[PDB]
Amino acid sequence: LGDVAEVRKSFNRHLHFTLVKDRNVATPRDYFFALAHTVRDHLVGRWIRTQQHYYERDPKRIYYLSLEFYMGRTLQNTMVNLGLQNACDEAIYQLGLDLEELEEIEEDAGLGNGGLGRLAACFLDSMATLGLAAYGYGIRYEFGIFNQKIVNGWQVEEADDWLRYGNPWEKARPEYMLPVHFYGRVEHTPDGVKWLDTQVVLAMPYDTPVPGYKNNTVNTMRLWSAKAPNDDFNVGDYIEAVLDRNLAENISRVLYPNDFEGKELRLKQEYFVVAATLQDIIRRFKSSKFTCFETFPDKVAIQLNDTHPALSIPELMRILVDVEKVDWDKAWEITKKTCAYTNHTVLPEALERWPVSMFEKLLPRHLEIIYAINQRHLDHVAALFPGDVDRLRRMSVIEEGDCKRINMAHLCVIGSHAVNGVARIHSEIVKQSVFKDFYELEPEKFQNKTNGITPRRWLLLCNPGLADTIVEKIGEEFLTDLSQLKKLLPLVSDEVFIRDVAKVKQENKLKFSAFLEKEYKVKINPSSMFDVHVKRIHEYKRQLLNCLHVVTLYNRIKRDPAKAFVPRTVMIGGKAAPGYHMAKLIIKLVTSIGDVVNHDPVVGDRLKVIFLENYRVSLAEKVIPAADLSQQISTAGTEASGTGNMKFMLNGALTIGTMDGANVEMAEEAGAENLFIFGLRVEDVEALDRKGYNAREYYDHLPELKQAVDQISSGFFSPKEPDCFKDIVNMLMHHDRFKVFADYEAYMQCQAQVDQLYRNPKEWTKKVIRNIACSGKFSSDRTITEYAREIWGVEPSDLQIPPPNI
Ligand SMILES: Nc1ncnc2c1ncn2[C@@H]1O[C@H](COP(=O)(O)O)[C@@H](O)[C@H]1O
Ligand SMILES: *Cc1c(COP(=O)(O)O)cnc(C)c1O
């Protein structure tokens, strides 16, 4: 291989010319950067051609607007999409360095927070792999969300300085800079509408390449960085200047801030993307090779990932009507046609709203436009449904209450040609209840796009073991098209293949066990069940339900210490919101139970509790390839979809969960007999809510529940602070809105079936091979082809990029 040789040549010249350092003064970070730069060079060749090919063969451009972009680590994905993974592994070894060591040096891209963020990052790869003409638009947050640190068993927020040493992937484009306008006043001149006396913030773009698997199509991600305009002056004009400089800087500083009026910043953040993005979008349309804006809805697609970029609608109206001199009605039919919405937040309350006063002050022009839109619309409603006063209020963009407020979700539907849902079941609720009146008027608008996960990151990267077990028995083709996993369905009875499936899982379990032993300092039993419950630390996610399970499990080994019980390694990961009092207590409860269960000799190795500190995109790639059991035990009627569960199924993990969200469509895809479904279903939940839930009906009338709960309340797990979980008890007893005790029995007797199925080796791995065979639907490429066809009006892989030279 001359590849292995070539990688070694460029690494040295990068270290010597780009980094300007010799091996004698180079840190492992200097070694990562030199490697990262070598891998980036191979992307550049495609990138330049891909972006010039789009200018040349002018296709319709897709624009994914999102605040969240949970990208994670780039190096590994980049060299796998380039096939150099093996050549680099050999070349890095040849330089007396470990690739795995360098990969761990790389920081997590502090651009996401949860499911919405990863959704974006997966989608971005799929569009690239499917040869699409797409772009990712977002904010270049400098400090991300935060780093989780468990101090004395509690969560401590640490600042994420992931840009301290700088990203070796992103390329700054200060020449493509744009102005974002704020505050000021409006004026109606004979020429047009003019927005003057405005405060200006600079938008500086940073582009990061998005490579496609195998294909020469490498897209671009434009993330904007807030900067302030430069310059006689007094103290009053010095202090305001130095303050304004910094205030602009904290727009692209931290994701989802609280500060209490850090609300205006969150609004400012949204308009910073919207304005910057759209000006750049339009610029590309008019800067295209060879009255002008008629071809706009045929050459531009704008997907509004949740209510965050809801301002794109009145902003596009603004730019077209006030700047481009376009007719309102012409520009409005364009707006509707060039905009598509997606709703993740189920039930009409988590739906984003903003006071009119706050809009009156910050975006006075956008308010006029929104007011105008929410009239030409209401008048059309008064045409179809005359005299219906209560429909008008139910459908208005402007809401009433303690003060007038603009419902951004209404504006998203009124302004979009297609509104979609994340899961079939969820999507129906969006139609039938969330936007009931908008649905009747236009049912053809409302759609569904079931979410997906990229098979490269969530399989080829993290679990190459399981991948190669499918590669030689099917052929690589399954990586392009995931539905080809049903081709291994007749291998449910193949004797040589079944043991080779568990061979991979165990070869992964040991690697993660070593990580667990080294980092957390606990004796890990690899022969035990790898129970996992990694997600947002929230009450509706029911982390406490899994707690109660391990409490009874601990008491069962204390009751019958002789009994040969099924060994486990209960893993609960995730992060609590900084203000969330209850979720912080929940993290403490897990650590309190662990400091009891792990530090006990009667228990030994048949039970280990371990809270996963700093659950990220990098950590998920470690835990999921080595996980036996997967928990998605959320209260039914809450989880809309969820993408986590999908990563497990593909990596050979039996899921436990209620009949809600992604669980419904998985049990539909693989059969409810092949998944540990338990607890109340949506209607039973509805019925219990009709009954009027009481906790004492469950606490007084149970043996091992009473024990487990009065253990927590007594302070059996917090001996030095016996009243530590007072608020946890008081909740589960009086103000528990996610019926935790109502699914206690159901969860445990379900867990008994889980316990017995794992007692048998072949029948567990047989039920597992069903899950891997049915995961095909849950491909991100499937969702992207569905967006490209049912919404964006584009042909997948119709425009392919040829191999260039120099
Ligand atoms: N006049 C032009 N001739 C050839 N390529 C261009 C031109 N303008 C832009 N491009 C391509 O488009 C990319 C950057 O422009 P944009 O797509 O507008 O961000 C570069 O990769 C260029 O190769
Ligand atoms: C996949 C993923 C999620 C989403 O999982 P859910 O169960 O849908 O909440 C969240 N966070 C990280 C870091 C992930 O990798």
The catalytic position among 38, 50, 643, 785 is 643
* Cβ atoms within 10 Å, residue 291: 7
Supply 641's token pair.
Answer: 């979809």
**Looking at the DSSP assignment, which residues form a beta bridge with residue 531?**
629
- Name which residue sits closest to atom 6 of ligand 1, judged by CA: 52
3.40.50.2000, 3.10.310.30, 3.40.50.1100, 3.30.365.10: which CATH number matches 453-779? 3.40.50.2000
CA-to-CA separations, 8 to 13, 294, 589, in angstroms, rounded? 9, 52, 50
- Index of the ligand 1 atom closest to the CA of residue 283: 18
- Please list every protein residue whose CB sits less than 6 Å from any atom of ligand 2: 114-115, 118, 535-536, 615-617, 620, 642-644, 647
Neighbouring CB atoms inside 10 A of 118's CB total 27
Three-state SS letters, 104-161: HHCCCECCCCCHHHHHHHHHHHHHHHCCCCEEEEEECCCCCCCEEEEECCEEEEECCC
For 462, the 3-state DSSP assignment is coil
Is domain 1-452+780-801 annotated with CATH 3.40.50.2000? yes
Q: Which atom belonging to ligand 1 lies closest to the Cα atom of 48?
A: 21
Strand 300-305 relative to strand 218-227: parallel, antiparallel, unpaired? unpaired
Answer yes or no: are the C-beta atoms of 459 and 467 closer than 8 Å: yes
Q: Which of 50, 52, 207, 278 for a ligand 1 pocket mutation test, highest count of atoms within 8 Å of Cβ?
A: 52
Say how many Å lie between the CA of residue 495 and the centre of ligand 1. 56
Buried b (16+ CB within 10 A) or exposed e, 513-535: beebeeebebebbbebbbbbbbb
Cβ burial of 138 (10 Å; 0-12, 13-18, 19+) is buried
Distance CA 361, CA 367 (A): 10
- Of 85, 126, 77, the C-alpha closest to 106 is 77
- Ligand 2 atom nearest the C-alpha of 632 is 7
Q: Which ligand is nearest to the CA of 422?
A: 2
Let me know how long the chain is.
806
Tell me how far the alpha carbon of residue 453 lies from the centroid of ligand 2, in angstroms. 11
Are 502 and 760 in contact by the 8 Å Cβ rule? The answer is: no
Q: Is the dihedral of CA 396, 400, 403, 408 positive or negative?
A: negative
* 3-state DSSP assignment of residue 609: strand
Catalytic-residue membership of 535: yes
Radius of gyration (Cα) for the chain, nearest Å? Answer: 27
Tell me which ligand sits closest to the C-alpha of residue 630.
2
**H or E stretch covering 569:** none
The reply, when asked if residue 176 is annotated as ligand binding, is yes
Write down the experimental method used for this entry: X-ray
**DSSP code at position 18:** I
What would the two tokens of residue 236 be? 């009053």
Which-ligand-closest: CA of 176?
A: 1
Q: Is 635 a catalytic residue?
A: no
Find the 617 Cα to ligand 2 centroid distance in Å.
Answer: 8
What residues does 178 pair with on adjacent strands? 203
For ligand 1, is residue 48 a contact (CB within 6 Å)?
yes
Instruction: Indicate which residue of 647, 767, 770, 777 is catalytic.
Output: 647
Partners of 135 in the β-ladder: 63, 220
Q: Where in the chain is the domain with CATH 3.40.50.2000?
A: 1-452+780-801, 453-779
CB 660 within 8 A of CB 738: no
Q: Using CA of residue 437, residue 440, residue 344, residue 122, what is the dihedral sign?
A: negative
Number of H helices, E strands in the chain: 32, 23
Assess whether 536 carries a catalytic annotation: yes
Which residue intervals of 641-681 are DSSP H helices? Answer: 644-650, 662-670
- Beta bridge partners of residue 109, listed in sequence order: 72
Q: Which residues does 328 contact at the CB level (< 8 Å), separation at least 6? A: 317, 321, 372
Resolution given for this structure, in angstroms: 3.4
- The widest CA-to-CA distance across the chain, in whole angstroms, is 91
Q: Which has the closest alpha carbon to 50: 76, 81, 73?
A: 81
> What is the β-pairing status of strands 570-573 and 531-534?
parallel
User: How far is residue 593's CA from residue 543's CA, in Å, rounded to a whole number?
Assistant: 13
Residue 496: Cβ-neighbour burial (10 angstroms; 0-12, 13-18, 19+): exposed
Query: What strands lie across the sheet with 570-573, from one edge to the other?
Result: 609-612, 570-573, 531-534, 629-632, 654-659, 676-681
Q: How far apart are CA 58 and CA 679, in angstroms?
A: 53
Return all residues near 183 (Cβ < 8 A) that are at least 6 apart: 197, 198, 199, 361, 362
**Ligand 2, from 68, 70, 778: best to mutate by most atoms within 8 Å of Cβ?**
70
- 328 residue type, one letter: W
d(CA 731, CA 737): 9
555-570 burial, b at 16+ Cβ within 10 Å, e below that, comes to eebeeeeeeeebbbbb
Q: Give yes or no: 701 in active site.
A: no
Distances (CA, A) of 552 to 175, 181, 337, 599, 650: 63, 59, 57, 17, 31
HEC states along 706-731?
Answer: HHHHHHHHHCCCCCCCCCCCHHHHHH
Instruction: Classify residue 500 by burial, with Cβ atoms within 10 Å: 0-12, 13-18, 19+.
Output: middle
- The ligand placed nearest to the CA atom of residue 56 is 1
Rounded distance between C-alpha atoms, residue 226 and residue 472, angstroms: 49
378, 441 contact by CB (below 8 A)? no
Strands 676-681 and 171-172: unpaired
Rounded to the nearest 10 degrees, how much is the dihedral formed by the CA atoms of 14, 19, 21, 22? Answer: -20
CB burial of 756-788 (b: ≥16 within 10 Å; e: otherwise) equals ebbeeeeebbbbbbbbbbbbbbbbbbbbbbbbb
3-state secondary structure of 505: helix
The response to whether 22 counts as a known ligand-binding position is yes
Find residue 206's DSSP bridge partners: 172, 223
Contact criterion met (CB below 8 Å) for 136 and 120: yes
- How many whole angstroms from 300 Cα to the centroid of ligand 1? 17
Output the CA 320–ligand 1 centroid distance in Å: 23
- 3-state class (DSSP) for residue 227: strand
